[PDB]
Ligand binder design. Structure first.
Ligand SMILES: COc1cc(OC)c([C@H]2C=C(Nc3ccc(S(N)(=O)=O)cc3)C(=O)O2)cc1OC
Ligand SMILES: [Zn+2]
Length: 258
């Protein structure tokens, strides 16, 4: 009876095995655009992905992860709210059964069709497992997806999903350029929060881009053909793998822009 997104093991159950689910800095949150304060002391954001080394794509039963070589500073996030250097280790998405839901963060309670998370760890803790034990251990760059025009930089991901349909399947995924997933603008919102899946650790500086990317209905339909289940188990479509908005509590969301 491990955690997931069903009625019997979904986000309302997680607190039973992971009590930090009801903690003070849980993610995601609703971003109230009229309450978020422009902070003129936020430095520009530095996304330096030109030397990024992608290796593998994995269906982990909750999402699919595109994994990077993080054994050196190759693909890093710096600046904005961050001190020091955060190494890209993986990206993944959360998405819905229909275009009206799927994002984890919301903007004035608006839900996007999906949300991309680019996950980075703070190099001053040496490895990822050490970083997630620290309040400033991770930086996740969150990017909303809306359904419209195709994202060309996403199609190599979409076309490999048939090969990793079920939990525990992986495929070689070299020479993938994550810069193809970014919007034009790096304007963002930032707040301190958590992992959005168990173990829900309160180790994340969230950086959520204001500008969504557009993907096509055909691209997101292929996300929805993935399976949560292992091969030769009953088919459960991988849809609605998003946690809903958590209480903001004693936190302030900061805007990079006026
Ligand atoms: C208790 O120790 C661990 C358990 C554990 O899973 C049960 C894990 C898992 C969780 C991991 N990471 C992760 C989860 C959510 C996000 S999101 N959606 O962007 O907020 C980003 C990263 C990971 O790599 O692995 C990591 C752990 O330690 C490193
Ligand atoms: Zn995520």
């Amino acid at each position: 009876h491990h955690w997931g997104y069903g009625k019997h093991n979904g986000p309302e159950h997680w607190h039973k095995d992971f009590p930090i689910a009801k903690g003070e800095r849980q993610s995601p949150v609703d971003i109230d655009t009229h309450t978020a304060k422009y902070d003129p002391s936020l430095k520009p954001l530095s996304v330096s992905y030109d030397q990024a080394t992608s290796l593998r794509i994995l269906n982990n039963g909750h999402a699919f992860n595109v994994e990077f070589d993080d054994s050196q500073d190759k693909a890093v996030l710096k600046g904005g709210p961050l001190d020091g250097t955060y190494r890209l280790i993986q990206f993944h998405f959360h998405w819905g059964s229909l275009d009206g839901q799927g994002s984890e963060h919301t903007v004035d309670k608006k839900k996007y069709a999906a949300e991309l998370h680019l996950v980075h760890w703070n190099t001053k803790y040496g490895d990822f497992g050490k970083a997630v034990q620290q309040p400033d251990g991770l930086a996740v760059l969150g990017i909303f997806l809306k359904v419209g025009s195709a994202k060309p930089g996403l199609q190599k991901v979409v076309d490999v999903l048939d090969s990793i349909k079920t939990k525990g399947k992986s495929a070689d995924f070299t020479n993938f350029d994550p810069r193809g997933l970014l919007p034009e603008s790096l304007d963002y919102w930032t707040y301190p929060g958590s992992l959005t899946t168990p173990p829900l650790l309160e180790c994340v500086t969230w950086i959520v881009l204001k500008e969504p990317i557009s993907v096509s209905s055909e691209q997101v339909l292929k996300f929805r053909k993935l399976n949560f289940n292992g091969e030769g188990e009953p088919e459960e479509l991988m849809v609605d793998n998003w946690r809903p908005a958590q209480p903001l509590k004693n936190r302030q969301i900061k805007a990079s822009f006026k």
